[PDB]
Amino acid sequence: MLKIIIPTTMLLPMTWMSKHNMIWINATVHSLLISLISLSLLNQLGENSLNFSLTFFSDSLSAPLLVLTTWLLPLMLMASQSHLSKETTTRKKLYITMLILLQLFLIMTFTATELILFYILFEATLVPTLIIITRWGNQTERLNAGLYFLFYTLAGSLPLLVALVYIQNTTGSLNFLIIHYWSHPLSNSWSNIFMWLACIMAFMVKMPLYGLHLWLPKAHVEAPIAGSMVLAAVLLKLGGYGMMRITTILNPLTNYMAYPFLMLSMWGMIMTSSICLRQTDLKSLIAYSSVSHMALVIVAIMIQTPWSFMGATALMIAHGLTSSMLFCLANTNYERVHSRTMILARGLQTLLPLMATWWLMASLTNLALPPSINLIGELFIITASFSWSNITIILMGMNMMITALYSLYMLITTQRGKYTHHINNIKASFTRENALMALHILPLLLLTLNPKMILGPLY
Amino acid sequence: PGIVELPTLEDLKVQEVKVSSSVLKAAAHHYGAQCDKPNKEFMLCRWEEKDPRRCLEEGKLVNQCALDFFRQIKRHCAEPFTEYWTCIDYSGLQLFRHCRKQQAKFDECVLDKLGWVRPDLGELSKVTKVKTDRPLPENPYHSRARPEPNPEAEGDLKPAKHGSRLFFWTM
Ligand SMILES: CCCCCCCCCCCCCCCCCC(=O)O[C@@H](COC(=O)CCCCCCCCCCCCCCC)COP(=O)(O)OC[C@H](O)CO
């Protein structure tokens, strides 16, 4: 890494000492350039994980996330640079500082070789995000939302810290390699039961799982757009990366204990998508949509079968690029109308023709048509879940049927209808918005040709 | 914890001196300078043996040697001795500065009839090389064995293997 981490860190003094107005220019230049460099890690060898140093290593699961995060960094810059152009230079510089720092932690977290090093930076992502949602938020509930997001993540992470150091004292080193090659049978016992619960709850809260998820509708909606992406597009998957790594030692206790989590995710995903069927805030619509997709990842991890892990990463990457897109979409309207109510701005295809097209493919990707990467992920989990139990196809498909109704629902309510009479401030979409949307959907459809890169560490 | 065996009542019958303090202190210096041979090694026994029971043999000798000194005065200028020690008691401090004239009378008598000279100032307060026959005790405190000290740390320092070894930190 050093070859990505150092350029990422070096963006921090660059943006601070950059020219007065060239901050957005230069930061966008090299963040795209750094993403190009991170494309180098998309290659993985036969079976051994790509190892660079003792503290840093990559595999066929971290690298597809690493490129996603570094590719995201330009996107938050352009999306947020609309409203941020109306404050002090230091304030705008402080934001770009914070996204650069937030991305820096994500790159170092995903390639962490020691589980303790993983946990330190995994929880360290809270500080850049927490200040983003609170300081630069555009509502009043953000103050309560930031507390909800911070406390939920921390309340689960702290048992992990106690559990993690326990492995250090008992088993020895916690390197992701030495853990794998020295896996021992975690026998069923009450102490092992809470050992299992502690090492799992921390990542479950950040998924989020059905019930430990009320921070998401508050955090995501109130957060600024530069944040509203990352809290949905990368760091939810950060909890995912934690699960797929920590479950190396939690066998065979996982199958005996997974039942409450499976039923909560498998049944709650129907309820969560049912919220999306009747919602009032467009941001909340996508937010609860993310919960349903992540809930499908939650069940996917726990069968611990080759197909499930592949469909886990496939949906995990695809949803992040998708859910990031919809937040850009809701941002554009929210700037023009200065409200988030769905029915307020009905009719956009009449006034904005291409915005409807971008909305069409955006709502289509969430609809997960074949061969879109969303479908290639959900379909894999359905087959893996069906092999686990034949009944689950009733629940698994029900969401697939239900997710069609709401995913096309904002398409009908916002785009396909009579334009609202009283609104008169809609402007022709800036070429920044359309260019940003292309930056989201073009890699997604391009990724369809070669799913092997994102298929996970079991291809 | 065991037996506290101590000498019987048989050996505790010495010819105890029947004099009082004034007559004891009236002579004092002459007695100290003429009966030092049984005093020194008995007191040395008291310090070296650290136990009263083991020095009973020397304990009786000093008392016995006192009698030989005491009755030697009786065959001699004991009448000046009586006038002396019967003048010392009258003072509450038993101090010699108020009985100098009788100090002379006792001294002049004992100077020629016996020859016991007056010990000069500081002469009694003197560490002496008393000859003795008993060997020194191997452990006067009867000390038991001593715990073996922990093995000594040694060996040239070597760099800490793989550095700090604390979590993921290296070097
Ligand atoms: C906010 C509430 C909690 C949210 C959910 C958190 C996750 C649920 C589980 C909670 C416990 C997490 C703490 C786990 C510590 C490390 C676990 C581990 O490695 O297993 C040990 C087992 O861990 C424990 O024994 C402790 C965890 C069990 C629960 C009791 C303490 C936690 C609950 C109370 C505090 C947290 C709740 C909030 C209070 C305000 C094994 O050691 P042993 O018991 O075998 O020790 C050797 C020998 O047999 C005797 O020691």
Curated annotation (Swiss-Prot), chain A:
Subunit details: Core subunit of respiratory chain NADH dehydrogenase (Complex I) which is composed of 45 different subunits.
Chain segments annotated as transmembrane: 22-42, 60-80, 98-118, 147-167, 193-213, 224-244, 257-277, 284-303, 308-330, 351-371, 391-413, 435-455
Role, per record: Core subunit of the mitochondrial membrane respiratory chain NADH dehydrogenase (Complex I) which catalyzes electron transfer from NADH through the respiratory chain, using ubiquinone as an electron acceptor. Essential for the catalytic activity and assembly of complex I.
Organism of provenance: Sus scrofa
Primary localization: mitochondrion
Protein family (similarity comment): Belongs to the complex I subunit 4 family.
Protein name per UniProt: NADH-ubiquinone oxidoreductase chain 4
NCBIfam families for this protein: NDH_I_M (TIGR01972)
